[PDB]
Design a binder for this molecule. Sequence first.
Ligand SMILES: [Mg+2]
Ligand SMILES: [Mg+2]
Lengths: 171, 175
Amino acid sequence: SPYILVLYYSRHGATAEMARQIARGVEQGGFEARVRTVPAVSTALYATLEDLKNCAGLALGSPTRFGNMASPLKYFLDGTSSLWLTGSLVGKPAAVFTSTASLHGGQETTQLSMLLPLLHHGMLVLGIPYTPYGASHFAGADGKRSLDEHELTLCRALGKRLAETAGKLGS
Amino acid sequence: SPYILVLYYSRHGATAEMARQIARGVEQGGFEARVRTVPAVSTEALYATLEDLKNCAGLALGSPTRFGNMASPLKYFLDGTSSLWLTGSLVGKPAAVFTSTASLHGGQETTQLSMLLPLLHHGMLVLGIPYSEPTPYGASHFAGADGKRSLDEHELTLCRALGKRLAETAGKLGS
Ligand SMILES: [Mg+2]
Ligand SMILES: [Mg+2]
C-alpha cells in the first residue's frame, strides 16, 4: 500500500527506462512503486499533487537541460506551493536521476540543481553511497543507448535505498 | 549598436522592475539595453526572441525564486536555445543574474547559483556584484508576501550597479 513515487520527464525515453529500473529497486526494497510522468508545456500516467503528497518517498528524474531539469518537470514543481506551505513532503526521503546525450558533463550539477526544490520542501535527501548525488546515464548522441550494467545496477540500488529508508522511517 | 539583453520572467512585477533598473545601469555603462520577458506556459512588455539572445553582447537573466530554481516559463525559453548552443552564439559574452523572492525563508543565493549553470553551459563569462568597492552572485530583492514591496534604495542601487558592470565588461571585451 505505501509507495515510492517515481516522477520523471522524458523526451526520448532514457529517463523513462531509468524510472522503470528505479521502480524495480523500490520493489526489491519492499515497497510499491508509482511511476508517473508530466505533460509537455508550451506558450506513464501523469502525476497529480495527491500522488506527490501521499508518497512515502520520491525519485525525481529528468534529462539534463543546460544544467537544470527540463521545463515541463519544473512547471509541475512550480504548482506545489500548497504542499510547501503545509509541510506535505517534510521528512520524506528523496533522490534524483538524470540522463544526458552530451559527452561533456552536466549531470552532476543538474542533479545538484534538482536537490534544491527537494530541500525547499523539507525532504530528507539521499543519493548513491560509495555520482553520490543521484543516478546517471549516458544516452548516446541519439538518446537510445541502453543503460549499461553499472547504470542499471545503480538505478535499482537507488530505488531500493529510497524504499528501505522509507521503511525505516515508517517503523 | 551592441546591446545588453535583460531577459526575465515576472509573475507579480518585482523582477520586471529590477529588469528596468538593471537596464538603467546598462545605460550608465555606455551600452544600449533591450529588456524582454517570456510568455507564461501551461500543459497541452515585449517577449524575447532567440534572435534577441543570439545577437546580444551580454545578458542579465532574472526570475522570481521558485523552489530554489528559476521559474518554469524562463526555463522553457532557455530549453529552446540548443541551436544557439551549437553555433556558440553566447560564448565569451558576459552574464549575470537577478532574483526576487516573496518569502523570508531564503533561497535567493542558491537560486542565483542554479541560474548560472545554463549560462556556463553556453560558455558565458559569469559575473556578480563585487562588494569590495566603496549576494556576490547577482542582484536580490525581497518582494513581500503579496510580491508588491517596492525595491528600496539599496536594492535599486545594486540593480543599477550590476547593469553598469555588465555593460562595462562587454565594453572592455569589445575593445
Ligand atoms: Mg523506524
Ligand atoms: Mg578590450
